């Protein structure tokens, strides 16, 4: 009976989260953010250039 009550609260919170996730995905797309422009992607690209200079020397 306690769990059934708690389950109702959880369903309401889940609906709230789904709404904030859409709003955030829309803000990232408007800023022109693509995958290759990420820190991780760009670091990865710099690490590839150093490796290539070492091979050329």
């Amino acid at each position: 009976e306690i769990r059934s009550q708690n389950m109702k609260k959880l369903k309401d919170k889940s609906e709230e989260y789904k709404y904030k996730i859409h709003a955030a995905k829309d803000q990232l797309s408007s800023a022109g953010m693509e995958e290759p422009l990420t820190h991780r992607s760009l670091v990865s690209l710099s690490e590839t250039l150093t490796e290539l200079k070492a091979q050329s020397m």
């Binding site: 769990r3 919170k13 990232l28 050329s56």
Partner: protein, 100 residues
């Protein structure tokens, strides 16, 4: 009990996803995205120039490697002898400066 545990698992996953997307919006502002683009373009131009130089050098080295191990032995000997001459000349120059 089975329904309750399912609802709890789904709610935790959605919280985690929301917080991830909020952090990404804070990290990649339009100004920063523009800079990240400039850095990419410079890095990409470097990767392209170095890939071309590596390819040309590898092509020339392949022509000498074709003259066999015996030639490599000769080259090693020549190189050793040039290095000793260079060392002896260097030693003679250093003894003249000391005549007080």
């Amino acid at each position: 009990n089975a329904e309750y545990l399912e609802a709890k698992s789904n709610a935790l996953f959605l919280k985690l996803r929301m917080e991830e997307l909020q952090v990404l919006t804070d990290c990649y502002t339009p100004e920063k995205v523009l800079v990240h683009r400039q850095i990419r373009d410079t890095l990409e131009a470097g990767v392209k120039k170095e890939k071309q130089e590596l390819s040309t050098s590898r092509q020339i080295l392949s022509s000498y490697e074709f003259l066999g191990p015996e030639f490599e032995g000769l080259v090693q000997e020549y190189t050793r002898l040039k290095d000793k001459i260079k060392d002896n000349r260097w030693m003679l120059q250093e003894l003249s400066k000391s005549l007080p």
